Amino acid sequence: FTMVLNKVTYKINAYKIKEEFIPKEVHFYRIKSFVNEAFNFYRFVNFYGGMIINKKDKSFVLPYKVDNIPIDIEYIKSLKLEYVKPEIAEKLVRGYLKSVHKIEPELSRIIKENIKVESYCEYEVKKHDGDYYLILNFRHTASITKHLWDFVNRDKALLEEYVGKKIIFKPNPKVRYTISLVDAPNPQKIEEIMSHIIKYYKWSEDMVKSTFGEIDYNQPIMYCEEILEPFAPQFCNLVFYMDELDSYILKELQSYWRLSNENKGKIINEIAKKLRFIDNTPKELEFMKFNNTPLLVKDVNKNPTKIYSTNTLFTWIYNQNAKIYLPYDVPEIIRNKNLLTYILIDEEIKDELKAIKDKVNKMFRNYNKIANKTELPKFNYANRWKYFSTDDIRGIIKEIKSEFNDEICFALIIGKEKYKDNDYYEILKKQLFDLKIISQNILWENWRKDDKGYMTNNLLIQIMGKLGIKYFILDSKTPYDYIMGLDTGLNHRVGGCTVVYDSEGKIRRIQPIETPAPGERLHLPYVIEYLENKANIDMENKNILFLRDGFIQNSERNDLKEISKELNSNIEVISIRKNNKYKVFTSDYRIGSVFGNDGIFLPHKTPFGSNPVKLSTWLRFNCGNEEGLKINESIMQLLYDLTKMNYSALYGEGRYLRIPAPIHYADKFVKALGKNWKIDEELLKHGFLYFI
């Protein structure tokens, strides 16, 4: 039991709901009276804080008794809340608090340059032990007041860099969409879009000019995730969360936006104090601490050696006494090859050419002297030093294209802090890859101050990853033959991606997934069928763990039961949610806990406040059976170990990822494909993270 474990106690944003606000009984009802096709049964029960039992029998459950728009209903049974499954009971208490006790209007009352910032509370109820807790989160939603088209400096390329961002169509800021695709500019469609919204809002033609301004004809025809209708970037606004922003952005802002987890806790406690439904004290929870799992690399004699961090992987570049580390595997496509390298320097930093040259040379000459007489490829950048401007990316692309390589090349981009314009560097990488040039950008200001070799080490880690080099592996082998990260973006040709990891934690495949057919969703049973039949991955007599930011539908459960017996494989699935309502009032990290069946995962150190990752519904399909597994120390350690299989050393908060590498990279590939990056089959098969 818990009396022998290394536990650290920490406060979370869970507050005990008072007795008077917990329903004693749940009540079963069915619609006895007639209902038409436009009835919308799900909305009807959801409004009255209920839940559907059977859609066909029009049966539901309410957290209260109704003594009689609402139609005539038939009472079936009453049941003590205590006899109800914890997951069902939590939602019924939420519905009771929402519908009967009006928690949403009371919460609004408590909380009542070109950025419009809005504040809101989000709530959920959790059953922990025999008690119900309200999860209380306070969020800040900011909106760019300047519209999407002018914001992106009227450039179709900059617009593509916004795929995966949240938007609102100006008149309705209550509907939040996600950019998933673009299209060529058309003056005919621009007229057609305007004419539709004039009709919907009963507008005069004058209204469009008044609302959106001087309309752009050569404007792109944007498209979105939820609605098949065409979008006009001039008519939309970017919407984001202040806590979803990167650390670098946060530094320039005032203290309130970079607040610590402890200080964020003090704000939550203030809302809890004014809320009559809950006790004021936050829930104290016991947390396990994850082990700092070692990594394996090869030594100069190609023998495995224990390493605890990648912070010393390329320390031998500067330090002559530092231990030389060699990769586990280099793909056959780039094995001991002289890669035609390009050195791209931003025009605005031309004065520091002497310091730039001496930095690129001292790094590559020390790398090449070791890359020679080993599997590692060499970088040959002789006479391929070129200047570029962010104002004309197309100009420098026309200069490179003139040289027909038709082979794998590299480009080291030396840039400067241009803020929003930093997306032009991402435009350069994307367009460079269309020409088969893998590239990495670095900010000169930061690299110039790197006297310890820290950034050089991180730059080389990222270059290795982009070249699909399996530098380091996990010291501990898992029961799983495969750990598969899955993201399902799309109603289009390619609807998703699976990033396949082996038992050692190395990328075996970056597998794009084609959607089944028009008018149907990309479900887990179909992904498995696709991997076996169209991707050529042997998935029989295997132990496979799937990682997804999503829940399994009821229809999938039986198909997954059949697939497990058909493959003679153990198929597991766990839900990993980066966007959740939990908050841990601490600056500590490498910690995990379980709150009413949910795993609360806090892996990485952060400069400012950090949000935990929620782990939910760990399922097992084996021998035609379905089994719900309890989130434990074993999986959390495995998930933590997977946040360490990072080659994105130059990005994010520190060395390790917030979310495990298989799911993290699946999401990054889906975004990259949305921004119209090229799909290079050979490279993805070899695990090249060229899109990072």
3-state secondary structure 594-657: EECCEEEEECCCCCCCCCCEEEEEEEEEECCEEEEECCCHHHHHHHHHHHCCCCCCCCCCCCCC
Output 280 or 336, the one with its CB closest to Mg ion.
280
Given 549, 556, 572, 641, the catalytic residue: 549
CA atoms within 13 A on the CB side of 22: 20
Give whole-number Cα distances, 594 to 279, 549, 613, 635, in Å. Answer: 21, 18, 12, 12
Output 271 or 408, the one with its CB closest to Mg ion.
271
Helices (H), 27-132: 41-47, 86-95, 103-111
The reply to whether 406 sits in an annotated binding site is: no
Output 278 or 666, the one with its CB closest to Mg ion.
278
Report d(CA 560, CA 570) in Å as an integer.
10
Torsion over CA of 145, 147, 151 and 156, rounded to 10 degrees? 160
The arrangement of strands across the sheet holding 51-54 comes to 51-54, 59-62, 25-31, 73-80
In the region spanning residues 564 to 583, those forming contacts with Mg ion, defined by CB under 5 A, are none
Q: Report whether 167 contacts 237 (CB < 8 A).
A: yes
Judge whether 72 counts as a catalytic residue.
no
Q: Binding segment for Mg ion among 72-80, 273-281, 286-294, 472-480 (CB under 5 A)?
A: 273-281
**Residue 16: CB minimum distance to Mg ion, A:** 9
Total residues in contact with Mg ion, by rule CB under 5 A = 3
**Residue 133: CB minimum distance to Mg ion, A:** 12
In the region spanning residues 40 to 79, those forming contacts with Mg ion, defined by CB under 5 A, are none
Output 282 or 603, the one with its CB closest to Mg ion.
282
**b/e per residue, 94-128, with b = 16+ CB within 10 A?**
bbbbbbeeebeeebeeeeeeeeeeeeebebbbbbb
The reply to whether 462 sits in an annotated binding site is: yes
Given 192, 520, 538, 627, the catalytic residue: 520
Judge whether 667 counts as a catalytic residue.
yes
Residue 285 bridge partners (DSSP): 10
**Of 584, 614, 621, nearest in space to 596 by CA:** 614
User: CA-based Rg of the chain, rounded to a whole angstrom?
Assistant: 27
Amino acid at 563: I
Output 79 or 111, the one with its CB closest to Mg ion.
111
Contacts of 246 (CB under 8 A, 6+ apart): 652
**Residue 278: CB minimum distance to Mg ion, A:** 5
Quick one: tokens of 582? 């939990």
Given 90, 375, 423, 487, the catalytic residue: 487
Q: Binding segment for Mg ion among 6-14, 274-282, 405-413, 507-515 (CB under 5 A)?
A: 274-282
**Residue 135: CB minimum distance to Mg ion, A:** 14
* 393: phi then psi, degrees, rounded to nearest 5: -65, -45
Output 124 or 155, the one with its CB closest to Mg ion.
124
Judge whether 57 counts as a catalytic residue.
no
CA 559 to chain CA centroid, nearest Å: 27
Report d(CA 686, CA 669) in Å as an integer.
15
Q: Binding segment for Mg ion among 59-67, 201-209, 269-277, 337-345 (CB under 5 A)?
A: 269-277
**Residue 273: CB minimum distance to Mg ion, A:** 6
The reply to whether 431 sits in an annotated binding site is: no
In the region spanning residues 201 to 230, those forming contacts with Mg ion, defined by CB under 5 A, are none
Q: Binding segment for Mg ion among 46-54, 104-112, 191-199, 277-285 (CB under 5 A)?
A: 277-285
The reply to whether 67 sits in an annotated binding site is: no
In the region spanning residues 279 to 308, those forming contacts with Mg ion, defined by CB under 5 A, are 280
**Residue 54: CB minimum distance to Mg ion, A:** 38
Judge whether 421 counts as a catalytic residue.
no
The reply to whether 692 sits in an annotated binding site is: yes
The reply to whether 279 sits in an annotated binding site is: no
* 419: phi then psi, degrees, rounded to nearest 5: 60, -120
The reply to whether 440 sits in an annotated binding site is: yes
Q: Is 275 in the site for Mg ion (CB under 5 A)?
A: yes
**Residue 88: CB minimum distance to Mg ion, A:** 26
The H or E element containing residue 578 is: none
Output 133 or 690, the one with its CB closest to Mg ion.
133
Binding residues for Mn(2+): 487, 549, 667, 692
Annotated catalytic residues are 487, 520, 549, 667
- Residues at the interface with Mg ion (CB under 5 A): 275, 278, 280
